Amino acid sequence: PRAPRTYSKTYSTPKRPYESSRLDAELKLAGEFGLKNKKEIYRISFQLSKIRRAARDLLTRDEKDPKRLFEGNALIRRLVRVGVLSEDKKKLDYVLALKVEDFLERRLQTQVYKLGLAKSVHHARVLITQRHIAVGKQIVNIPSFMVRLDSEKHIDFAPTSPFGGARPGRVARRNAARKAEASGE
Amino acid sequence: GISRDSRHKRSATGAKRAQFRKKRKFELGRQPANTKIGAKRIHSVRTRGGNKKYRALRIETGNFSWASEGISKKTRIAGVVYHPSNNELVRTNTLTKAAIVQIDATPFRQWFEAHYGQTLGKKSKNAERKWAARAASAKIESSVESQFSAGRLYACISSRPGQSGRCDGYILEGEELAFYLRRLTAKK
Amino acid sequence: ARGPKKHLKRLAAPHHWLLDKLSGCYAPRPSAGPHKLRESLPLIVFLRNRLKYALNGREVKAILMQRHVKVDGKVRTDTTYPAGFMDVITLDATNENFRLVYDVKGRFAVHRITDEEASYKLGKVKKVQLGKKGVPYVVTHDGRTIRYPDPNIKVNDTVKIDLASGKITDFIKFDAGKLVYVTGGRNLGRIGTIVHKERHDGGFDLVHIKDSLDNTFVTRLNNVFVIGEQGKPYISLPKGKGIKLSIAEERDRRRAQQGL
RNA sequence: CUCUUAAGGUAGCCAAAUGCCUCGUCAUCUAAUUAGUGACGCGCAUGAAUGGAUUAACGAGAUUCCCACUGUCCCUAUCUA
RNA sequence: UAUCUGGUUGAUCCUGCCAGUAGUCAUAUGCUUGUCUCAAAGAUUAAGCCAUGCAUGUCUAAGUAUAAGCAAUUUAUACAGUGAAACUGCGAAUGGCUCAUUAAAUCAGUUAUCGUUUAUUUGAUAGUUCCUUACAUGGUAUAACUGUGGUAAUUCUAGAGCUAAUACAUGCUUAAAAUCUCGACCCUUUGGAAGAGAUGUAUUUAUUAGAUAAAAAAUCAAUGUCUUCGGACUCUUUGAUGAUUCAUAAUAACUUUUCGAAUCGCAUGGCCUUGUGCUGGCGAUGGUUCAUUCAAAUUUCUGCCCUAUCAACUUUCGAUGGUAGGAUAGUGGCCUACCAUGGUUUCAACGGGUAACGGGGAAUAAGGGUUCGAUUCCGGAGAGGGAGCCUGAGAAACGGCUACCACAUCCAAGGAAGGCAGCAGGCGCGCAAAUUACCCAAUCCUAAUUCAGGGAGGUAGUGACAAUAAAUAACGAUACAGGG
RNA sequence: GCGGUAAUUCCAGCUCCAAUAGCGUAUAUUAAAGUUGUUGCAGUUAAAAAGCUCGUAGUUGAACUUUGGGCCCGGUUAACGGGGCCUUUUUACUUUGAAAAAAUUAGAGUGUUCAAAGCAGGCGUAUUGCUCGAAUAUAUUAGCAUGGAAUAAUAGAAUAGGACG
RNA sequence: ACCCACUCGGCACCUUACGAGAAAUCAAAGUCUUUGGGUUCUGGGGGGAGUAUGGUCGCAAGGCUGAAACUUAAAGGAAUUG
RNA sequence: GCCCGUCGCUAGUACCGAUUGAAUGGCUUAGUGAGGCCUCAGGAUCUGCUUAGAGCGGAGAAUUUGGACAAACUUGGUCAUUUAGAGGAACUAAAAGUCGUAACAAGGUUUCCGUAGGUGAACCUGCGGAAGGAUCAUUA
Ligand SMILES: NC[C@@H]1O[C@H](O[C@H]2[C@@H](O)[C@H](O[C@@H]3[C@@H](O)[C@H](N)C[C@H](N)[C@H]3O[C@H]3O[C@H](CO)[C@@H](O)[C@H](O)[C@H]3N)O[C@@H]2CO)[C@H](N)[C@@H](O)[C@@H]1O
Ligand SMILES: NC[C@@H]1O[C@H](O[C@H]2[C@@H](O)[C@H](O[C@@H]3[C@@H](O)[C@H](N)C[C@H](N)[C@H]3O[C@H]3O[C@H](CO)[C@@H](O)[C@H](O)[C@H]3N)O[C@@H]2CO)[C@H](N)[C@@H](O)[C@@H]1O
Ligand SMILES: NC[C@@H]1O[C@H](O[C@H]2[C@@H](O)[C@H](O[C@@H]3[C@@H](O)[C@H](N)C[C@H](N)[C@H]3O[C@H]3O[C@H](CO)[C@@H](O)[C@H](O)[C@H]3N)O[C@@H]2CO)[C@H](N)[C@@H](O)[C@@H]1O
Ligand SMILES: [Mg+2]
Ligand SMILES: [Mg+2]
Ligand SMILES: [Mg+2]
Ligand SMILES: [Mg+2]
Ligand SMILES: [Mg+2]
Ligand SMILES: [Mg+2]
Ligand SMILES: [Mg+2]
Ligand SMILES: [Mg+2]
Ligand SMILES: [Mg+2]
Ligand SMILES: [Mg+2]
Ligand SMILES: [Mg+2]
Ligand SMILES: [Mg+2]
Ligand SMILES: [Mg+2]
Ligand SMILES: [Mg+2]
Ligand SMILES: [Mg+2]
Ligand SMILES: [Mg+2]
Ligand SMILES: [Mg+2]
Ligand SMILES: [Mg+2]
Ligand SMILES: [Mg+2]
Ligand SMILES: [Mg+2]
Ligand SMILES: [Mg+2]
Ligand SMILES: [Mg+2]
Ligand SMILES: [Mg+2]
Ligand SMILES: [Mg+2]
Ligand SMILES: [Mg+2]
Ligand SMILES: [Mg+2]
Ligand SMILES: [Mg+2]
Ligand SMILES: [Mg+2]
Ligand SMILES: [Mg+2]
Ligand SMILES: [Mg+2]
Ligand SMILES: [Mg+2]
Ligand SMILES: [Mg+2]
Ligand SMILES: [Mg+2]
Ligand SMILES: [Mg+2]
Ligand SMILES: [Mg+2]
Ligand SMILES: [Mg+2]
Ligand SMILES: [Mg+2]
Ligand SMILES: [Mg+2]
Ligand SMILES: [Mg+2]
Ligand SMILES: [Mg+2]
Ligand SMILES: [Mg+2]
Ligand SMILES: [Mg+2]
Ligand SMILES: [Mg+2]
Ligand SMILES: [Mg+2]
Ligand SMILES: [Mg+2]
Ligand SMILES: [Mg+2]
Ligand SMILES: [Mg+2]
Ligand SMILES: [Mg+2]
Ligand SMILES: [Mg+2]
Ligand SMILES: [Mg+2]
Ligand SMILES: [Mg+2]
Ligand SMILES: [Mg+2]
Ligand SMILES: [Mg+2]
Ligand SMILES: [Mg+2]
Ligand SMILES: [Mg+2]
Ligand SMILES: [Mg+2]
Ligand SMILES: [Mg+2]
Ligand SMILES: [Mg+2]
Ligand SMILES: [Mg+2]
Ligand SMILES: [Mg+2]
Ligand SMILES: [Mg+2]
Ligand SMILES: [Mg+2]
Ligand SMILES: [Mg+2]
Ligand SMILES: [Mg+2]
Ligand SMILES: [Mg+2]
Ligand SMILES: [Mg+2]
Ligand SMILES: [Mg+2]
Ligand SMILES: [Mg+2]
Ligand SMILES: [Mg+2]
Ligand SMILES: [Mg+2]
Ligand SMILES: [Mg+2]
Ligand SMILES: [Mg+2]
Ligand SMILES: [Mg+2]
Ligand SMILES: [Mg+2]
Ligand SMILES: [Mg+2]
Ligand SMILES: [Mg+2]
Ligand SMILES: [Mg+2]
Ligand SMILES: [Mg+2]
Ligand SMILES: [Mg+2]
Ligand SMILES: [Mg+2]
Ligand SMILES: [Mg+2]
Ligand SMILES: [Mg+2]
Ligand SMILES: [Mg+2]
Ligand SMILES: [Mg+2]
Ligand SMILES: [Mg+2]
Ligand SMILES: [Mg+2]
Ligand SMILES: [Mg+2]
Ligand SMILES: [Mg+2]
Ligand SMILES: [Mg+2]
Ligand SMILES: [Mg+2]
Ligand SMILES: [Mg+2]
Ligand SMILES: [Mg+2]
Ligand SMILES: [Mg+2]
Ligand SMILES: [Mg+2]
Ligand SMILES: [Mg+2]
Ligand SMILES: [Mg+2]
Ligand SMILES: [Mg+2]
Ligand SMILES: [Mg+2]
Ligand SMILES: [Mg+2]
Ligand SMILES: [Mg+2]
Ligand SMILES: [Mg+2]
Structure with missing residues (x-):
């Protein structure tokens, strides 16, 4: 009789699986973002579709409708804050035109590459999932972390590890210690 | 035990409905105590929520009321005579409501003659004071007086003896007296 | 179902307690009160979940059993006691007082009133009738019955009520x-x-x-x-x-x- | 296709009151059934007013079983004219 | 989140299904299996059967302590700290489980109680008890206990002797009126008067009031004052409802006469004739009616799946209604007596099926829909099948009793005991589902009650049910191919 | 559909595609399916109009009753909306509301490191501190209250037993 | 009686496709994805099969009603060329 | 070419079927009837009121009269769901058996319908249809 802890699934998988063209467009997006599996492409097209459908039934409401007012403007304000909808495209009509590369662009992986710090999307992830890209004080190792517009400027190497701070790795710190008996006693 | 539920019955369409659940105490019923004349015996029933019903088993001698006089004295209750539901109660002389019994008339005769001063149906100077005032109200009925000649009066039990434990009633008067008279003579 | 129900389940509780889904299967089930446990505040909710003074179930008792809390002028020992609308809840050692009044979302609000204005309360007269011997009486929303009241008072009024004693100080039609x-x-x-x-x-x-x-x-x-x-x-x-x-x-x- | 002598057992029914073999075989009933019933049928030798098949009702007709019933029996005893 | 493709031909366009594709809080299975979060899980087959353990008990300053109980050394010589037992008290009717019944039934939303019951909780309510001899407080009865015992055996008990109460049974007690009756004697008018009862509350019956909307004179019986031989008449008591025979009050009685404190803890104050007199403080537990609260019972309106190879159904023996009664907590054919012949139906009754508990909800994502809901919440039902019942405020209870049927255990053969659809766990079943673990710390519930008890619950094990996150590599160097 | 001697299809090697801590299979159910069709099917010949007419139930059923004119008051981005005057002055339905459990669905808010979730949190002087939250909307049947009077029903004076004072 | 013009109501016919349909064709088989005037009946791949069973009607032959198991990728329509 | 039916073998499903066939559950007529509950009694023992001793009251065990409730047993019926069966009689699968060649060309007797009778088999014949025909056609 425990309280019924809820949940949901984050993705929607495509109807027609074998389409010869769509397969390619996804493969590119996997490379020109640096994604693990095709599920990380699905996760976003599902997010976008619910985002779109939200705006879809929102523009059906004749204007100056509080639902088209309060809700429609509570979307944009969230949609710009992450850097997806550009600083001002802001409209219910410009979210419907908003495509899949826009969210993917704002991922912590696709940022950590963007400004310095990485010089690869594969170096980016490997950097993220291993400890240190940390945003601010807190380490965030999620390659999907979704950098917000103004959280951008706070992202640099972390207070720990050879890249941002105290001590180098114990790969090298083991290398300096094996010449300790070689070049020492 | 007996069940007061309506779901052992049939639907107004006539259908017979399956037994939906068991019997529960709150829908129960219990056995009649058929109360007949005799030396007073009254059994207690432990009702719903505690409390008490009082079973009349043997009932003699309970309270009765002369309507028009506004006075009530206790008398014997000889037996039953009529009863609208079941003559079986008449024959068996059982006491219930609507009974139409017969009661001792004498304590009802005494009050009258010590009040209105006229003997019924044929010093102390303070008394003739009172009896003077109370006259001109001193005619009762031809039908209500005649029973005092016999010594027993026509009375109707208004209590629920098996419930309260008291068996009480009121002497028959008016057309209600006439109604049960036209029964007793034109039935028995 | 064979008798009185002695339990309350979390998610079956009143929404205006603002309990959290997890943390247990059960709510306090307010005691039999002046107020209907539908609309009411169990003392544990007030102290622990609002005033944030008590951290435990066992801790709320340690307060009451330390004689601290009163309500409507009188000390209240009961953990689940159902403090309702227009109550008082004085804590001497904290020097505070609270009159329970609803939010604009509809919850009981945490509302401090001073050492006075906790003297009296208001209550809605639910019925006014004749008692024994002819003695008229009146009873409020919280089940206060007050005897020999003002012949003007009818149902759906309010009554200003001194606490330490009782009775009626004026009223509002x-x-x-x-x-x-x-x-x-x-x-x-x-x-x-x-x-x-x-x-x-x-x-x-x-x-x-x-x-x-x-x-x-x-x-x-x-x-x-x-x-x-x-x-x-x-x-x-x-x-x-x-x-x-x-x-x-x-x-x-x-x-x-x-x-x- | 043949064959003597005209044809060469059709519809039906069957170990049937018609079957030798025979207590036919299978199933059913029974603890056990040369009995009964249902089947099967190259049927010694069923079979069409020499009438064939079916058939409600009827029967001091023949037959099997069931319930009831009982000295029929176990197993005999007593009574009256 | 408005899509289709493959397959009938020599080829063709149609019809049309088969086939492909995708989703499933949908179950199984196979192969594989690293990290975080999260956590379904013997429902389906068989509400089939179950060895064993556990799951319901509970004391505050404040009912009952002479424990041959512990403990200091008690102003403590009646008791007093602690405190097993046992008595009294309260709970054991909540939980937790399961979905077998159940098709107008349950259930939902929505009404009803001017148709009832209600431990408790909160708020108020009581001067009245004897009548013609405890009120500085009546009487016995018993458990634990001790001691003599029986039986193979049980949460079995016999008889002997002690002793308690908020147990059992009893029983006094207090103001001033005022109104009623009845009435010794005084004896005339418009004439009166001691003192003898009766009046708390509840039970039972009968009767009365509970009223008004606009105003004027005549009638009868007896008064109801009053003044100065003239007779004047001044005044109508409701609380509430849409609504009552409602609340509440009145008279006459009634009653194996309900409650009306022989009750405990902390304090030790104040008076004066100083008797251990008189009076006093906040508490606890009770108790009568009333309201309240926690509930319960019935109840209005409307709404269920397949079925006509179910078309008529109900009415013996209650079917529909009327009256009276009885029974209930109370309404009612709930039951009985008498009486009538009613009640439902093609707008689908009645009957059958359901691999049917209803609902909140779930899957699917143009719209309109189709499908599912044993299962966290609510309501319902049940504890092997049936019925009956004791205690109680609440049970037709099953970790209560009694019987039957079906199981099934012990036995010394005489007898004795039992109910896992609670938690685990065993057998069985099948495609199909986990440990005989820890714990009251959390949520909470129960109690005499901050303390104790809780397989409710929580923790942990098992756990690729389902869901979230998303490692298995990253950046150069050198050696050849190749883009301005 | 493949395999009957040079197999694009079996058993394998090699490589390659697909999704990937998960992919496959069986079964159910939904979409596809306008192949259940109210929206929205089809019926000469593909599946399918009763041989024919009657006719109860059911469904369905012509039109007509205040039309038009004249001013006014206050509303929201001359178009339009709402409320009153003057002119001879019973239902079904539709709107607004109330009363609707929490979960769940939708959805606002918030940096659980992301997230699925959760309903927390956030600023501080961090030496006896401040403080905003826990929004919002929903099965549209029934019931209740309300505005609306088109549409469609229903009653009303025919031997006047009609209205009116 | 015949002719002529008009007009209802008939049994058909012709041309055109305005439209419609898979086509053959169709003044309805039109007014249909610009999908609703009212209403009745039937059909939902091919078989199995109008079989089995129950009911009912008939003297009977039979009629009316009318399944399922199982099996199968076609069956079928119109038109075209051979 | 396509193609029908009997006949012959192989496997599969359902059907009819003697067994007055079995099994499970519900509702049941009849007969019998535990148990507690109510009631008429009873009175082992113990025991109070008024006055050795007598009269009238209370407490109460076994046992018992009658009554409602009513499990359950026996015997019948009814409804439901499941199921055994000698034999019977279909249908469906698998292919290039046997017999003939019914239909598709005027398929060699146009085909088809309802009905009726007949025939190893498809089929043949009678009557009345239809054209889905092999004729939209004789104002000539
Ligand atoms: N054994 C009969 C069963 O009938 C079922 O369904 C049958 C019927 O229920 C259904 O409808 C029939 C219809 O066919 C027939 N030609 C006309 C008839 N009125 C309909 O009948 C049905 O609907 C009517 C109301 O219209 C009901 O009154 C009736 O009870 C019901 N059977 O059509 C089916 C017959 O064609 C299923 N077909 C199947 O379970 C089985 O065939
Ligand atoms: N959970 C609290 C509430 O419970 C409600 O529960 C429903 C029922 O419990 C309640 O039913 C009636 C009620 O209408 C009425 N006014 C009072 C009545 N005592 C209630 O009925 C009650 O008694 C009946 C009969 O014994 C029982 O069958 C029923 O379970 C019980 N609740 O009415 C409620 C609404 O229909 C609702 N589920 C919902 O409003 C809310 O969840
Ligand atoms: N569970 C087995 C038995 O069930 C009995 O109870 C049975 C009845 O209450 C109820 O039976 C119903 C019956 O009421 C109703 N009038 C007819 C219905 N067909 C029966 O149904 C029953 O049997 C049919 C097969 O006939 C099954 O398909 C169905 O699942 C079953 N519920 O269903 C139960 C059967 O599951 C008894 N409780 C008891 O003897 C025993 O427990
Ligand atoms: Mg009964
Ligand atoms: Mg509580
Ligand atoms: Mg409620
Ligand atoms: Mg022969
Ligand atoms: Mg011969
Ligand atoms: Mg011949
Ligand atoms: Mg012949
Ligand atoms: Mg023979
Ligand atoms: Mg023989
Ligand atoms: Mg024969
Ligand atoms: Mg013979
Ligand atoms: Mg024999
Ligand atoms: Mg034989
Ligand atoms: Mg034979
Ligand atoms: Mg033979
Ligand atoms: Mg032969
Ligand atoms: Mg021979
Ligand atoms: Mg011969
Ligand atoms: Mg011859
Ligand atoms: Mg011959
Ligand atoms: Mg012969
Ligand atoms: Mg013959
Ligand atoms: Mg005969
Ligand atoms: Mg004979
Ligand atoms: Mg014979
Ligand atoms: Mg014979
Ligand atoms: Mg003999
Ligand atoms: Mg074809
Ligand atoms: Mg498919
Ligand atoms: Mg089970
Ligand atoms: Mg479970
Ligand atoms: Mg329960
Ligand atoms: Mg049923
Ligand atoms: Mg309801
Ligand atoms: Mg004694
Ligand atoms: Mg004793
Ligand atoms: Mg003794
Ligand atoms: Mg009264
Ligand atoms: Mg108290
Ligand atoms: Mg009749
Ligand atoms: Mg009976
Ligand atoms: Mg009646
Ligand atoms: Mg009555
Ligand atoms: Mg009643
Ligand atoms: Mg009749
Ligand atoms: Mg079921
Ligand atoms: Mg269901
Ligand atoms: Mg359910
Ligand atoms: Mg959807
Ligand atoms: Mg949809
Ligand atoms: Mg669709
Ligand atoms: Mg089930
Ligand atoms: Mg189910
Ligand atoms: Mg439940
Ligand atoms: Mg069991
Ligand atoms: Mg008691
Ligand atoms: Mg129960
Ligand atoms: Mg229980
Ligand atoms: Mg029980
Ligand atoms: Mg148990
Ligand atoms: Mg022995
Ligand atoms: Mg278990
Ligand atoms: Mg197994
Ligand atoms: Mg599993
Ligand atoms: Mg499972
Ligand atoms: Mg705890
Ligand atoms: Mg504890
Ligand atoms: Mg203690
Ligand atoms: Mg899994
Ligand atoms: Mg590895
Ligand atoms: Mg090869
Ligand atoms: Mg392939
Ligand atoms: Mg290969
Ligand atoms: Mg569809
Ligand atoms: Mg529509
Ligand atoms: Mg179609
Ligand atoms: Mg056709
Ligand atoms: Mg027909
Ligand atoms: Mg949500
Ligand atoms: Mg019209
Ligand atoms: Mg559409
Ligand atoms: Mg078909
Ligand atoms: Mg036929
Ligand atoms: Mg037939
Ligand atoms: Mg063709
Ligand atoms: Mg065969
Ligand atoms: Mg019987
Ligand atoms: Mg008996
Ligand atoms: Mg066979
Ligand atoms: Mg045969
Ligand atoms: Mg040949
Ligand atoms: Mg051939
Ligand atoms: Mg031929
Ligand atoms: Mg020829
Ligand atoms: Mg030829
Ligand atoms: Mg030839
Ligand atoms: Mg021919
Ligand atoms: Mg032909
Ligand atoms: Mg012929
Ligand atoms: Mg032959
Ligand atoms: Mg044809």
């Missing part, structure tokens, strides 16, 4: 344009005045209302509590004073005082 707090409903927790009382023979009279900002709305007569004279309550209302600011209006006020 029910007619056009009186101050009213809404006891429960869609509009519960609001405050306003009487635009009209729609009479209905055989139950459920509609009471029209207007607030300080000139909004109209209706609820049930049984949930209409007279709190005083128009623009002047007889007790101290909290922030917003039951004004029902629109959801859109809310957003601004939150992003108004939010800055620098």
